[PDB]
Design a protein around this ligand. Structure first.
Ligand SMILES: O=C(Cc1ccccc1)Nc1cncc2ccccc12
Ligand SMILES: O=C(Cc1ccccc1)Nc1cncc2ccccc12
Ligand SMILES: [Cl-]
Ligand SMILES: [Cl-]
Lengths: 305, 305
């Protein structure tokens, strides 16, 4: 019993965190094999950030301009190249702690663990979701740039996020490990704002199934709904559309609890139209959308790494 | 910016998790130096659990009755002793991944990270608080016994909890790493129930200061309160008494935000009376009590917004 916001064990990623210093700017790098990946804005001054020409700023740098520190050991940079918004620093030493890994680009609604780091040192781990507006509601301070997002599938770390910036609302923007930003964001000190966010419907449904598995049934009702009528109500409350794929992915949870996906959609409809009426679901007065159907199954079955 | 429930990076603890088997029973052990610590109920059958005589069950065991597995390597048990509710298995190999560590016994209201494990393999990490009734609201399934709670302030792991059991309400009970249970619990299948739980007042106040640091002030008011009048009101909502120690502990956050502790107590009184009126505080519709004053100072910026 119990249901917590749970992150993956961060050990395989902790062994990859390094400090990258260029001039006055220090941030985090991910050391995998003989390459250190970090945000390309590490080469920028506060004036450069206003309107950066990264190719021009980078061509003026030599390998010895980048100081890379892995614990209390300096790594020598033997090459440097840019791939989208990520700087790749070739180092002489392959990381002996390099886990089995892949670079994966995630979709909004998918969740991942973030190992927040400062000066190449991990400080904390938390779970979060890529919002439908492509931001993440993270917890980051200055120096956290280069901190990464990941999932674990068996013994393989799938790196899906690298932190680059904080937007004026306090939400965060970053890239996949190939340097492609999630969302319509650019790595430049300029006016940028997150779009109006929506609730990840399939995730709320997954969390309602987790509540049922943990003995919270007060919100269940005798009603069902069509997928189309549910989506009309979802559009009205700034909830993402629920697709037939979402209904299919919720199949296992539906079979385990005996509550059909469209039967659970009628509970969600009622919760959106009427509220919680002073009650909680899994200790929450809000509908939680940062657990995917897979996260729910994984936590309510004890999958290990 | 941002405020998340954040766990410590679990890597230093992952390198200590082993599987302990005694007969048909399998659970987790913590391998530090040449000793494996695990719940002593590993020697019990499901039957034995009503009234186990651990000294009698243990005297019938030899070292070779305990199978300890670290990854795909069997460790040889060369000694065994019981210390309170923890079994200590002396092994022939010191753990090369043993971090700098200490065993610390915590007080209710203190937070810690839990590395949930099954079969000696870490499955997830989450943040917990020791409830005032000495239970933890964890997320544990069968086989999670031996999973540990810890804090990592600097490079030192302070082990504060070892999971032993799930109480009938779905909350969890366990011991410090010296085998002393937190709360009036015993490792017996006898009728045991958690006492009525209360809200950790000092933690809610710390979280209100975190909200002020992150720019939210909607809940503040022009009022102050005496410590005694606050306690008379707060006990009516099942809130723990706030002591002068708690007021002292909140001093640094009070100085940083410019809001006196008893002025913040008046905001809390009003929040308990009014509810949130459709508003949130740090993305939460409930008052959060699983962040200590120390957690808030560690996660929040030293500059208020
Ligand atoms: O936004 C940037 C840098 C940047 C990157 C791209 C364009 C402009 C600026 N860094 C930060 C990321 N997270 C949290 C922060 C908290 C305080 C200050 C800075 C933070
Ligand atoms: O309580 C025990 C065993 C035990 C230990 C001590 C006395 C009686 C019984 N084990 C478990 C610990 N955690 C979560 C659980 C979730 C589901 C089932 C069992 C769980
Ligand atoms: Cl450019
Ligand atoms: Cl193992």
């Amino acid at each position: 019993s119990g249901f917590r916001k749970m992150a993956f064990p961060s050990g395989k990623v902790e062994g990859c965190m390094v400090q990258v210093t260029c001039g006055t700017t220090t941030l985090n790098g991910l050391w995998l094999d003989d390459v250190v990946y970090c945000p390309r804005h590490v080469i920028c001054t506060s004036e450069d950030m206003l309107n950066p020409n990264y190719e021009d700023l980078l061509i003026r740098k030599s390998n010895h301009n980048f100081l890379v520190q892995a614990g209390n050991v300096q790594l020598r940079v033997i090459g440097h190249s840019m791939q989208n918004c990520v700087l790749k620093l070739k180092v002489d030493t392959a990381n002996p702690k390099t886990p089995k890994y892949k670079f994966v680009r995630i979709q909004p609604g998918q969740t991942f663990s973030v190992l927040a780091c400062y000066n190449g040192s991990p400080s904390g781990v938390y779970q979060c979701a890529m919002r439908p507006n492509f931001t993440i509601k993270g917890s980051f301070l200055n120096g956290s740039c280069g901190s990464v997002g990941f999932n674990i599938d068996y013994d393989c770390v799938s790196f899906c996020y690298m932190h680059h910036m904080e937007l004026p609302t306090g939400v965060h923007a970053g890239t996949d490990l190939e340097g492609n930003f999630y969302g319509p964001f650019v790595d430049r000190q300029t006016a940028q704002a997150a779009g109006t966010d929506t609730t990840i419907t399939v995730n709320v449904l997954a969390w309602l199934y987790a509540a049922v598995i943990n003995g919270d049934r007060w919100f269940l009702n005798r009603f069902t709904t069509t997928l189309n009528d549910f989506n009309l109500v979802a559009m009205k409350y700034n909830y993402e559309p629920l697709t037939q794929d979402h209904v299919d992915i919720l199949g296992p949870l539906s079979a385990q609890t005996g509550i059909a996906v469209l039967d659970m959609c009628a509970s969600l409809k009622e919760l959106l139209q009427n509220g919680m009426n002073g009650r909680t679901i899994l200790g929450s007065a809000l509908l939680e959308d940062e657990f995917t159907p897979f996260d729910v199954v994984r936590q309510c079955s004890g999958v290990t790494f």
